[PDB]
Amino acid sequence: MKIFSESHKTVFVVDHCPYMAESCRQHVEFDMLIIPLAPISKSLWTCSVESSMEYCRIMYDIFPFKKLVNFIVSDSGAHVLNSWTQEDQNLQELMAALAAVGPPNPRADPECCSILHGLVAAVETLCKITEYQHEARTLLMENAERVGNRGRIICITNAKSDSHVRMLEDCVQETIHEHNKLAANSDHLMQIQKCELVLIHTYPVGEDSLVSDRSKKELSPVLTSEVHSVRAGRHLATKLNILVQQHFDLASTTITNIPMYDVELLHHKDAHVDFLETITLKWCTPRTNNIELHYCTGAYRISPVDVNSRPSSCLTNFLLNGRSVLLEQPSKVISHMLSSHGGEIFLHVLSSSRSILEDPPSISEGCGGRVTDYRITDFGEFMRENRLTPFLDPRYKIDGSLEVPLERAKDQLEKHTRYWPMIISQTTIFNMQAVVPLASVIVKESLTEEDVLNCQKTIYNLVDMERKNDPLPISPKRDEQYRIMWNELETLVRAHINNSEKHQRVLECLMACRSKP
């Protein structure tokens, strides 16, 4: 839908009771190369944190903006780890905050807390306004109602029994009801329109699933709870991977035949509306400069599902170094292209079907097609002198009004074409090297004193050639050629008098020094 959908606001609630401190019974074997040590294992807190942060990493890679997350560990209190500003939505801040929270207390107070505090703080968090929501509300003056506050809460906890799940769902429904009632009166707290819930229950491998799965169940016209049960370790990570794929409408790609194994990527599902559960695009041999402007119907950010691994790291390093990669679908047709546009790897979806703009009318038949003296190199110089560059800092024009650089570009483009003949045979002042300083300076807005001196030198040199009657380009008596060239020079200069006063000075000099009987 729009920007303000359920995926625009996602809150993570991770349990932090001493229940999430026992090992997950999935001993790791980091000891490979006498008698090895006892294998290490990760707590349920560690597994939930790892999987949640992988979810966050994938979302941040594919959606750098307009998709935010809130991280709420649920302990004795409810410690919110980051805010809704698009500056605390950073992985490094989240790792710092989780390190501050630390491992769950094993022997402080086992049954003094629960998870419901995290959920109450999460629903109290869904009411706040993201900076994008505030901007939309302040833009929709007197109509700031078509901006939803839909969200989503993900809860990873070691539920004791199914009744615990049901009372958690009752608690969250009650919290949304009460907080909606509270936010109806107030103004700086939005009313939640849809708060989907996920209540992933994690248990060690080998223990019975004391809580069974349950499909989506609408507890309200504002809630839709769904319960998952999955073993801690790799299964929980896979569950949250499926969750991130289905929350943001992601898709998978399995790029193969990479010259040195497969590499899996995660992008938006819109990149696979052309082909139509992972596509298997095959790497194609890159050419140096075969073509440079491909017709891409969409560019989507990607994120490796195995980023640290050697094949995906090799592919991403190759892409980041500067070159691109063309991918083919299963004679062969090129359907995609991976390009890194300045440290951001993109997946372009090229078009391989018939072009409706095929066999277009020849430019040699249309209007002006039978003309062979076009100032094509002159216009090339015009194009290359009127290029575009980005400006970071804002500049002030006079007072209280900063200049939009696009407006400056358009003003310059209009300025440089006040007098600009099209065919070579039309113009004569633009066909000799003497007037190059005059042409390249007069079009400017503010002339330096050296520029004025150069214009004076050019005018005096033109007078000298007139005195010597050096033949002019063909582009029609010897004196008539110089008379018409002076007339064209006056036409050029007379059109730029409004730029400044030095243009007026050079115009007066030109009028005085021209050979006008």
Footprint of another protein on 206-235 (CB under 8 A)? 234
**Positions of chain breaks in the chain, given as the residue before each break (C to N > 2.5 Å):** 33, 260, 276, 330, 475
Q: Among residues 278, 142, 191, 182, which one has the least CA distance to residue 9?
A: 191
Distance CA 136, CA 131 (A): 9
Task: Tell whether residue 369 is a contact of another protein (CB under 8 A).
Answer: yes
Q: Which residue of 18, 118, 148, 204 would you call a contact of another protein, by CB under 8 A?
A: 148
Q: Among residues 88, 203, 99, 202, which one has the least CA distance to residue 156?
A: 202
Sign, CA dihedral 442-448-449-454, equals negative
3 state DSSP class of 340 = strand
- The full length of the chain comes to 517
Task: Tell whether residue 42 is a contact of another protein (CB under 8 A).
Answer: yes
User: What is the total count of residues that contact another protein (CB under 8 A)?
Assistant: 127
Q: Which residue of 49, 176, 199, 472 would you call a contact of another protein, by CB under 8 A?
A: 49
Name which of 109 and 407 has its Cβ closer to another protein: 407
Q: Which residue of 134, 177, 415, 483 would you call a contact of another protein, by CB under 8 A?
A: 415
CB of 420 to another protein, least distance (A): 6
| Amino acid in position 130 | T
Strands 333-340 and 345-350: antiparallel
Task: Tell whether residue 114 is a contact of another protein (CB under 8 A).
Answer: no
Task: Tell whether residue 405 is a contact of another protein (CB under 8 A).
Answer: yes
CB of 324 to another protein, least distance (A): 8
Task: Tell whether residue 54 is a contact of another protein (CB under 8 A).
Answer: yes
CB of 214 to another protein, least distance (A): 25
CB of 468 to another protein, least distance (A): 33
Name which of 329 and 461 has its Cβ closer to another protein: 329
Q: Which residue of 260, 293, 398, 512 would you call a contact of another protein, by CB under 8 A?
A: 293
Distance CA 308, CA 43 (A): 22
- Contact (Cβ atoms closer than 8 angstroms) between residue 256 and residue 262: yes
Contacts 24+ apart (CB under 8 A), 419-426: 419/491, 419/492, 419/495, 420/382, 421/375, 422/374, 422/375, 423/371, 423/373, 423/374, 423/375, 424/373, 424/374, 424/375, 424/475, 425/373, 425/474, 425/475, 426/475
Q: Which of 157-165, 179-187, 190-198, 344-352 is the region at the interface with another protein (rule: CB under 8 A)?
A: 344-352
x/- track of binding to another protein for residues 447-486 (CB under 8 A)? ----------------------------------------
Q: Which residue of 85, 246, 297, 500 would you call a contact of another protein, by CB under 8 A?
A: 297
Question: Strand order in 250-255's β-sheet?
Answer: 263-268, 250-255, 278-279
Name which of 82 and 303 has its Cβ closer to another protein: 303
CA distances, 514 to each of 421, 495, 508 (Å): 22, 17, 10
Distance CA 88, CA 82 (A): 6
Name which of 390 and 476 has its Cβ closer to another protein: 390
CB of 417 to another protein, least distance (A): 4
Task: Tell whether residue 288 is a contact of another protein (CB under 8 A).
Answer: no
x/- track of binding to another protein for residues 373-392 (CB under 8 A)? -xxxx-xx-xxxxxxxxxxx
Give the relative orientation of helices 116-126 and 162-185 as an angle to the nearest 10 degrees. 30
Task: Tell whether residue 259 is a contact of another protein (CB under 8 A).
Answer: no
Site for another protein in 305-324 (CB under 8 A): 306-309, 312-313, 316, 320
Q: How many CA atoms lie within 13 A of 476 on its CB side?
A: 7
Q: Which residue of 191, 351, 461, 487 would you call a contact of another protein, by CB under 8 A?
A: 351
Name which of 105 and 504 has its Cβ closer to another protein: 105
x/- track of binding to another protein for residues 62-81 (CB under 8 A)? --x-----------------
Task: Tell whether residue 141 is a contact of another protein (CB under 8 A).
Answer: no
Name which of 273 and 453 has its Cβ closer to another protein: 273
Q: Which of 97-105, 277-285, 486-494, 506-514 is the region at the interface with another protein (rule: CB under 8 A)?
A: 97-105
- Contact (Cβ atoms closer than 8 angstroms) between residue 104 and residue 45: yes
Task: Tell whether residue 423 is a contact of another protein (CB under 8 A).
Answer: yes
Instruction: Tell the residue number behind the tokens 């500049």, with chain if given.
Output: 395
Distance CA 155, CA 141 (A): 36
Q: Which of 55-63, 462-470, 477-485, 486-494 is the region at the interface with another protein (rule: CB under 8 A)?
A: 55-63
